[PDB]
Subunit: 302 residues, 2 copies
């Protein structure tokens, strides 16, 4: 059979998948650590200027982010086990190192704002448990030796972990800087993280599309239906998380309904990129509510 | 049994091994890539100003470095499988990413100087085959679940692959910049690599000493004897590699004999740091010859943010 992404190549170069360097180069240019940032102004703003509803939203957003980011994340560091090419060990290790810079950043934020205790007991929160049990279950095949099962796990990983499960919280936190001028340093971290995650998702999409090019029959009706139904179930889970984030009431800078449409639009954009039929078909008026997101990310990255 | 470095800890913090962050922060602060660096003047130096003996010493040194660096290197990225702590997944992943920056840097150098053909046929060189055969023994237990065997693989990996195998070649290349002002940007790459590799070696040493603290009986006479004899055999291989590097004759900027003592000194210093008896006992006047190595590396790494 013809050489494929699953087959070992021994020689370093030429790369069979040279576009890998577009993603590693993007990470290189965006390289950042949290020690570059002082949160004294943000802590003061948090305690002195934010309402109870705003304090709760900020706290629960960061706790939700940390549930994903403050962890040992082995996926990217292991893609070479499935795609045994020098360039994918490179891509994998590059993204793996990023995740440690992320875990350290969000661990510091938890320390600085005084939420280590609440983070430690976060599995007491039922909506978090459901997200964990959802994510555990649907991403079970990230360690499968079966390449078809693994491909599906990569689709879901790229959609859920690198996008759906984070970006609503990123949006919430950036909204405080955009509309109220608060949490500027926290928003620095959030903006840099969102840039990295977008690169991670885009790298995932790249790999998925290469597998599709090489093995079109992996993308049969049964597999497409599994992905779509699994992705649908994320909405319920993440929508309940927003109810918990806003458990002390709605806030001025951002609204839940717009965040739900934001999530749905981002899902559909990812599905189109991998030739899977859209699920939600969000109307322009609805997803434009948070169209400021990209602009604000760019602003707080500088 | 008490919690050890080999036992899984689930919670992220506090770290049981917080000194990990000294190593990751050092790598973070030194972060560099090859992509903004250009070698037009270096290539002109190479062709216009170097004798055949110097050209060949440079070429063969780069080929020897590339033999180790231009490869898929999985060790660091897998230390979490052996030390299942969040901080060691962090250390491992940080050092793993570094190795891809290195492989890309040396792949670029091979291209720029036109050595791709020779690199592809490098196993035709007997001393290189001997090095591969020998490195295969350092790496042989690096996937072992036997923690004593894995520990020995880590010792050999740290003191040979990270702190010695490359350093004679780094010194050769730096000597052209130090003594004649040539090949400045190649020396930038070399110096930045040397800094990273030293951090890798020191991170390995840190781990080895934690294992020694927790499991003193792993360092029994049998184990010490194996390490010391394995390391001795390395010298012979690397000394032969030097004969090949300088096959066209001795050059002005650096001497083979000094490089051998430099290597022996570096080995013994590493062995002392992990409480293993020294092997070579190198004279003060002998290791003084390449005492400049550290300060040249430091000099070539100063204020290079935009270059990096
Ligand atoms: Mg691995
Ligand atoms: Mg074990
Ligand atoms: Mn992340
Ligand atoms: Mn990610
Ligand atoms: Mn290296
Ligand atoms: Mn190294």
């Amino acid at each position: 059979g013809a050489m494929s992404i699953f087959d070992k190549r021994v020689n370093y170069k030429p790369f069979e998948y040279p576009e890998v360097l577009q993603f590693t180069e993007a990470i290189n240019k965006a390289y950042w650590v949290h020690t570059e940032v002082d949160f004294t102004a943000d802590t003061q703003d948090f305690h002195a200027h934010l309402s109870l509803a705003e304090k709760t939203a900020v706290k629960n957003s960061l706790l939700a982010i940390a549930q994903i980011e403050v962890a040992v994340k082995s996926f990217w560091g292991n893609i070479y086990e499935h795609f045994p090419k020098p360039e994918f060990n490179g891509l994998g290790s590059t993204f793996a190192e990023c995740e440690f810079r992320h875990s350290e950043a969000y661990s510091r934020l938890l320390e600085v704002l005084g939420y280590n205790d609440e983070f430690e007991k976060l599995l007491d929160v039922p909506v978090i448990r459901r997200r964990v049990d959802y994510l555990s279950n649907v991403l079970k095949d990230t360690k499968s030796q079966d390449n078809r099962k693994y491909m599906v796990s990569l689709i879901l990983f790229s959609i859920l972990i690198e996008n759906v499960s984070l970006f609503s919280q990123f949006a919430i936190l950036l909204s405080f800087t955009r509309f109220k001028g608060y949490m500027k340093n926290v928003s620095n971290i959030i903006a840099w993280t969102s840039i990295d995650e977008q690169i991670h998702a885009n790298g995932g999409i790249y790999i998925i599309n290469k597998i599709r090019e090489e093995f079109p029959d992996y993308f049969d009706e049964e597999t497409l239906a599994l992905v779509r139904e699994t992705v649908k179930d994320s909405i319920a889970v993440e929508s309940d998380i927003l109810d918990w984030i806003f458990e002390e009431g709605e806030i001025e800078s951002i609204k839940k309904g717009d965040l739900v449409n934001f999530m749905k639009f981002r899902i559909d954009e990812s599905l189109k990129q991998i030739n899977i039929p859209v699920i939600f078909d969000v109307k322009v008026e609805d997803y434009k509510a948070l169209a400021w997101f990209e602009e604000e990310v760019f602003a707080n990255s500088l």
